[PDB]
Structure formats: C-alpha cells, structure tokens
A paper describes a structure:
Here, we reported the enzymatic characterizations and crystal structures of marine bacterial esterases CrmE10 and [name]. The [name]-hydrolase family, a superfamily that includes the bacterial lipolytic enzyme GDSL family, consists of enzymes possessing four strictly conserved residues, Ser, Gly, Asn, and His, in four conserved blocks, I, II, III, and V, respectively. Among these four residues, Ser and His serve as catalytic residues, and Ser, Gly, and Asn serve as oxyanion hole residues.
According to sequence alignment, the catalytic triad of CrmE10 consisted of Ser29, Asp178, and His181, and it was composed of Ser13, Asp162, and His165 in AlnE4. In mutants [name]-[name], [name]-D162A, and [name]-H165A, catalytic activities toward p-NP esters were almost abolished. In this reaction, Ser is a nucleophile residue, and His is the proton donor/acceptor. In [name]-hydrolase family enzymes, the residue Ser on the catalytic triad was considered an essential element for aromatic acyl substrate binding, and His was considered as the proton donor/acceptor.
Author numbering: 0 to 188
Write the structure that this text describes.
Amino acid sequence: SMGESRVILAFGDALFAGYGLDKGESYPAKLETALRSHGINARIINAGVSGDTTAAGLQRIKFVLDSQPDKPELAIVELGGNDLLRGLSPAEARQNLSGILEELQRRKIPILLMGMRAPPNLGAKYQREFDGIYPYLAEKYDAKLVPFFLEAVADRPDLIQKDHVHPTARGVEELVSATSNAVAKALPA
C-alpha cells in the first residue's frame, strides 16, 4: 500500500493494556494485524491502563489526546469494568464516560464504544442499571456500539486467564471446613 498508517486510539483498561500477556498479544496489537485483512494499515495507540476506572479515564483523556503526534482518526473507548469490580455507582460511571465522549466529540474524533456487562454477583437491579449505560451513551454521542465486547469469550473459560480467585459465600464455608482444624490447633489452649 501507499501512504502513512491510519491512527486509532485504544483508550481502555487491562483488556487493552494486555495484562498477563506477552509483547504483541494484546487486543490492540492483534487488532492492528487483523485490520490488514480489511485493507487497512493502522497504527493503534495502546492507551490501556490496567485498573483504570471511568473516573481515571476521564482524568487522563485530555492528556492522552494532547500527547499524540497524530490526531486519532477513531477512538475506541473500553472502560467501566473496574467500576463494576469496585461495585461503584452506575450513574457515576455513565457521567464519567459522558465526560470522555464529550472531549472526543469536541475534537471531532469518531467513537466506537465497547459495551461492558455486569455479572449476576451485583444483583439484577445493579446489573440492569450498569448494562443500560452503554446503549444510552452510544445514542447520546452518536457513537458506534459493540453491545457486549467480551461476548466471544463469555462461554469460554478455556480462553480466560486464571488470576483472581475470590470465593463465593459458599466457597468461604468450604475453606473454613478445610482450615478450622489448623486454626484451632495453632491457637494456644
């Protein structure tokens, strides 16, 4: 092909940063290769930061855009998972993401929003509220939405890293049954 690469900003959290993966295995790195098959030579700016909340993304979006030598031609926004993991207000996550999209829209940078979904642990009220923020934002900011970014791995535990292992309430009971003897023995009589 002739010409310089198309510049895409991948603005996100651990899922963009490539947490737990080797060089070149991250989603942005593999997406850059895959777009060659669409006839596109892209340079994808990896602005993934592991553990970023929507508030942390809002805090840095201007800095990240002002740091670019070449203005992004598309910004892919993937945040809210860490808000979920901290049980933070869905309303505040919506407000934070709105601030990020407003800054992109001010600069006339097209937006692709990666939809996040809440697991059942947070309960149905929280899950419905959180899940609804992404279509709301996509409509409000005229953004393209991928409704469920992690849909392709949702039923594929073989495609998910083993990392954090937080027991359920029943799992805690299991651990107590296994370890109470050792605790009772360790405590002086």
